[PDB]
Ligand binder design. Structure first.
Ligand SMILES: Nc1ncnc2c1ncn2[C@@H]1O[C@H](COP(=O)(O)OP(=O)(O)OP(=O)(O)O)[C@@H](O)[C@H]1O
Ligand SMILES: Nc1ncnc2c1ncn2[C@@H]1O[C@H](COP(=O)(O)OP(=O)(O)OP(=O)(O)O)[C@@H](O)[C@H]1O
Ligand SMILES: Nc1ncnc2c1ncn2[C@@H]1O[C@H](COP(=O)(O)OP(=O)(O)OP(=O)(O)O)[C@@H](O)[C@H]1O
Ligand SMILES: [K+]
Ligand SMILES: [Mg+2]
Ligand SMILES: [Mg+2]
Lengths: 337, 394, 242
């Protein structure tokens, strides 16, 4: 249970290492809350930057403050866009969390309009609420600006351009910031040459905890060598691996592709042209003739694993073939030996 | 007796749950490891088994899942859910399929929950579950990806024991996931299956044909080991190896040669496998050409002359008709001369066979390779000396 | 059945014993008149193996194709999801332990229907694990069926075109109604001697064999061998027209 207790600490965690962002959001809600007014704040960032976690923290703190009467009471509501099949179910959620309970999306939206013509509403990943007419976004952002509406809106998504089609952004995590979170809870061990090794990344936090959690799995069955192995089992590109393990005729077919490309110089060629090249190579390697039924199988083996991008098999000799891997990568996979 | 057949048929055709695991020793450790961690402890993980098709995945996960549930605590406390991208084409179908495999059909339908996640969470809360997603590629293609996102979202932040194990053949899988789902996927837990060495292939050949401990089996295995080394079986197995590097293709080869074994032919021979190999090596489109009428052939030779004259430009019936008329013109008498509607019937039959493709007033291009044509003509049973001379005119 | 004897030995031994397992999928190709389904139905009828036979051009949709296959086993069916469900739920002392056969004729039309339907059928054995064999037969080469993500590759069995000799032996000696079979033989040998180079379809040759038979033997009843001279211009009248 020594280095095994370090397993238990990776999957979720607390408390935040985003110190400055937290304060900004707290003061935003506190400002709007103290005044008995509404507002909206859009939060950008990379998927791993601690946006929803920080918000949840700010909420728990504001509820504590609401118990001592430091800040006005009370209610809070959260809904996730990716948790719904059909965007319009949002109106049901919001209403169901408030009074009035169940109703259709049409009747709910009408009711929310009535209520809004204090409450904190978190809409996490409203990128999913995009619709042709975008009525729901227009409503969520219009509601807090009504006189009779006291509503504070916190909108999370991954892109800065969303509101362009009262704002904040979470930058990706740096060398030191990631290094911080890992040792931040290693307190079982107060092994730390690794925490900085894994810490060079782009830019998610989940990568760190999941990577190092795998490193411990390597150790048992932690040094820097264990983490290099951990990363090489994850971020390592599988394409070059597959080309090395591909069969004989599969490689000759790639050589055929590269031959046709070096002739034309384009990124597309037809199975017919590639076929002529493949015949030439099989002739020069002492191989048997590449029966077109075989070569079609091969070309599908390489298109099933996405080494190739191939037109549907119905087109027969007119298949147009693109490489899903850069020519330099293939030459390196074939020529390494 | 036929007891041989009953065995190899469940091994070759159906996929034998128990067999020898070749070269997966590392990958099995990582999968079985993770599986203990989610089943025995309260940990939640997600992993992808990624290989070419026909090798690896489904047997690995099947073998791993079996050994896992042989633990008494596991069999009682662990539920497993098997999903497939072919069967469930919609995340709503999948939701109701999870509800079905979890024996949670007692919800029952009276509460339609406000959100997809709320319905999924309500199912798990009614205690680990191992989610197997086969043909993971297709689950990535569902609209906004609700099933993947919320399974990973539940795998990470919900602390409900769950195991999300995908199977895919795509080296491109990770690029098919949204930024959000890619993050929540326990990052790039990846098992790769791929291929082996030729000596390992031959050892596999002899191991799959041999019979287990079940004097009849002992005599059988001695003869297999004799086959393992032969200049014939080996030069055939290599030819298949240079294409396959796959145990499923091998299984087919062993199966076809297994029909050759009867009560009058007790055990396989070199010829049994050579014949079985010949059936697989046939060129399908060459076989189809062999059965055309001499009219259809002459049309293809007309099309051949048209691609060699106009430089691979498409053509229509008219110009084919003209070039074909130039063929019968040689003799004043009518031998191959037929009425235009009939020639077009045969022409339309070539299209009906998808030996010509469109893009008469429609332009089309020939789907045959010239070496297929000249080889077929030499192998054609009745081919008249006149059409052969015409074929080489170009 | 004649001249297919070799294909019967391959396709019969593949069936093996009925309680065994067979290929998850088999794909037969060949021409219209190759005799594919005549051989398939006989083998399924004679033994007699439980089976179903369905025409893919008749059923264009899923509802129709899948409801036929389910009904014919002895049932509202939308998506292939519920076929494995309700095919797996179809088991009894009749089907319990045995190989079940599903023959999809003109599978070439499956390509145009539903993306997941042809793959689901190729693997149907392990999807329901019910000991099934799906038999595809079409005039289109297997190379054109393959999808992007792939599939379980079936066994590709080739039913070769009938030769001119295979045609006569099948076409002639099996209905010599009013005469010696040698007389009807010389008749067919002349029939093919004209129409073969144009029409190789056994189906159509049987028509013309029936059509022009009376005129061929008319000089016999009227008291007038070597009748090739008699009907050849008449046969050539029908050749370039029919
Ligand atoms: N500073 C941190 N300390 C501890 N854990 C962190 C930190 N930053 C991120 N995490 C990890 O990230 C998760 C919190 O989610 P996060 O706030 O990144 O969601 P999100 O950014 O809204 O999700 P997405 O951006 O993908 O929509 C936690 O479960 C934790 O494992
Ligand atoms: N390393 C191996 N150990 C055991 N059997 C193997 C191995 N590699 C290939 N096989 C055989 O090849 C077949 C592969 O089946 P499986 O479904 O497990 O993977 P797959 O065919 O790639 O799956 P998919 O349906 O995604 O293509 C099995 O019948 C199995 O017996
Ligand atoms: N050996 C034979 N003896 C007698 N008749 C035969 C023979 N072979 C084929 N036929 C003829 O062909 C018919 C059988 O159809 P066949 O088996 O050619 O269908 P199919 O090949 O499955 O059709 P398609 O290929 O167009 O789907 C019989 O009814 C008979 O008219
Ligand atoms: K059987
Ligand atoms: Mg979020
Ligand atoms: Mg599989």
């Amino acid at each position: 249970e020594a280095r095994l207790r370090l397993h238990v600490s990776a999957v979720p965690e607390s408390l935040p290492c985003r110190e400055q962002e937290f304060q900004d959001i707290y003061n935003f809600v506190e400002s709007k809350l103290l005044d008995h007014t509404g507002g909206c704040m859009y939060i950008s960032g990379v998927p791993g930057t601690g946006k929803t976690a920080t918000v949840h923290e700010v909420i728990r703190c504001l509820q504590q403050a609401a118990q001592a009467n430091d800040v006005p009471p009370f209610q809070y509501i959260e809904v996730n866009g990716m948790k719904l099949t059909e965007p319009h179910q949002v109106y049901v959620q919001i209403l169901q969390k408030l009074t009035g309970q169940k109703a259709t999306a049409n009747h709910a939206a009408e009711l929310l309009a009535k209520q809004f013509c204090t409450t904190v509403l978190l809409v996490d990943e409203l990128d999913l609420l995009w619709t042709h007419k975008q009525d729901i976004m227009y409503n969520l952002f219009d509601w807090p600006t009504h006189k009779e509406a006291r509503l504070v809106v916190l909108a999370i998504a991954n892109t800065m351009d969303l509101p362009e089609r009262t704002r904040m952004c979470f930058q990706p995590y740096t060398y030191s910031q990631l290094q911080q979170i890992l040792r931040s809870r290693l307190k079982h061990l107060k092994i730390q040459l690794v925490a900085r090794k894994v810490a060079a990344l782009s830019g998610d936090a989940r990568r760190c905890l999941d990577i190092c959690r795998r490193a411990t799995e390597i150790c048992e069955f932690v040094t820097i060598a264990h983490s290099m192995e951990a990363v090489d089992e994850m971020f390592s590109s599988s394409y070059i691996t597959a080309i090395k393990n591909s069969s004989v005729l599969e490689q000759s077919f790639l050589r055929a592709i590269l031959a046709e490309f070096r002739r034309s110089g384009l990124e597309e060629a037809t199975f017919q042209q590639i076929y002529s090249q493949h015949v030439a190579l099989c002739r020069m390697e002492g191989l048997p003739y590449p029966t077109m039924s075989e070569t079609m199988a091969v070309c599908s083996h390489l298109g099933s694993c996405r080494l190739l991008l191939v037109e549907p098999s119905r087109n027969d000799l007119l298949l147009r073939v693109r490489l899903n891997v850069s020519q330099d990568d293939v030459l390196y996979a074939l020529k390494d030996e | 007796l036929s007891q041989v057949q009953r065995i190899l048929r469940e091994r070759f055709c159906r996929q034998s749950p128990h067999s020898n695991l070749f070269g997966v020793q590392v990958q099995y450790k990582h999968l079985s490891e993770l599986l203990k961690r989610t089943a025995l402890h309260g940990e939640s993980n997600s992993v992808l088994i990624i290989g070419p098709r026909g090798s690896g995945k489904t047997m690995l996960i099947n073998h791993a899942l079996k050994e896992l549930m042989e633990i008494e605590e596991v069999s009682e406390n662990v539920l497993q859910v098997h999903l497939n991208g072919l069967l469930q084409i919609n995340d709503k179908i999948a939701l109701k399929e999870i509800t079905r495999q979890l024996n949670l059909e007692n919800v029952v339908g009276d509460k339609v929950f406000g959100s997809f996640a709320e319905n999924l969470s309500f199912l798990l809360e009614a205690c680990p579950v191992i989610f197997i997603l086969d043909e993971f590629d297709l689950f990535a293609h569902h609209k906004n990806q609700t099933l993947l996102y919320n399974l990973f979202d539940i795998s990470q932040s919900a602390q409900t024991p769950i195991a999300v194990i995908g199977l895919t053949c795509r080296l491109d899988i990770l690029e098919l996931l949204e930024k959000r789902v890619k993050s929540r996927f326990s990052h790039r837990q990846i098992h790769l299956m791929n291929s082996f060495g030729f000596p390992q292939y031959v050892k596999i050949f002899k191991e799959q044909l041999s019979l287990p401990a079940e004097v009849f089996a002992e005599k059988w295995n001695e003869n297999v080991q004799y086959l393992s080394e032969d200049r014939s079986v080996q030069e055939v197995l290599q030819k298949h190896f240079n294409i396959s590097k796959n145990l499923r293709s091998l299984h087919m080869l062993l199966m076809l040669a297994l029909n050759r074994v009867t009560a009058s032919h007790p055990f396989m021979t070199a010829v049994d496998l050579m014949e079985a190999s010949q059936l697989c090596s046939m060129d399908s489109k060459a076989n189809i050409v062999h059965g055309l009428s001499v009219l259809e052939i002459c049309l293809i030779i007309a099309m051949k002359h048209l691609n060699d004259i106009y430089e691979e430009e498409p053509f229509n019936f008219q110009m084919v008709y003209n070039e074909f008329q130039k063929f019968v013109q040689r003799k004043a008498h009518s031998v191959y001369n037929f009425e235009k509607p009939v020639v077009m019937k045969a022409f339309e039959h070539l299209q009906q066979l998808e030996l010509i493709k469109p893009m008469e007033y429609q332009l089309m291009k020939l789907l045959l390779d010239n070496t297929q044509i000249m080889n077929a003509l030499q192998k054609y049973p009745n081919c008249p000396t006149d059409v052969r001379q015409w074929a080489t005119s170009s | 059945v004649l001249c297919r004897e070799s294909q019967v030995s391959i396709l019969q031994s593949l069936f093996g014993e009925r309680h065994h397992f067979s290929f998850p999928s088999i794909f037969i190709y060949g021409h219209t008149a190759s005799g594919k389904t005549y051989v398939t139905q006989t083998l399924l009828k004679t033994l007699e193996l439980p089976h179903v036979f369905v025409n893919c051009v008749e059923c264009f949709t899923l509802r129709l194709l899948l409801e036929q296959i389910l009904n014919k086993l002895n049932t509202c069916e939308t998506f292939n999801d519920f076929v494995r469900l309700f095919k797996q739920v179809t088991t009894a002392e009749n089907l319990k332990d045995q190989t079940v056969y599903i023959v999809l004729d003109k599978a070439e039309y499956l390509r145009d229907m539903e993306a997941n339907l042809l793959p689901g059928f190729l693997r149907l054995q392990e999807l329901a694990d019910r000991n099934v064999t799906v038999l595809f037969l079409s005039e289109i080469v297997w190379e054109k069926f393959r999808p992007n993500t792939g599939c379980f590759e079936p066994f590709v069995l080739y039913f070769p075109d009938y030769s001119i000799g295979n045609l006569q032996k099948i076409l002639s000696h099996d209905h010599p109604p009013e005469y010696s079979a040698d007389f009807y033989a010389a008749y067919i040998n002349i029939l093919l001697g004209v129409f073969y180079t144009v029409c190789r379809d056994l189906k159509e040759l049987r028509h013309l064999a029936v059509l022009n038979f009376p005129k061929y033997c008319e000089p016999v009843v009227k008291g007038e061998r070597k009748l090739w001279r008699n009907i050849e211009p008449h046969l050539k009248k029908a050749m370039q027209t029919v």
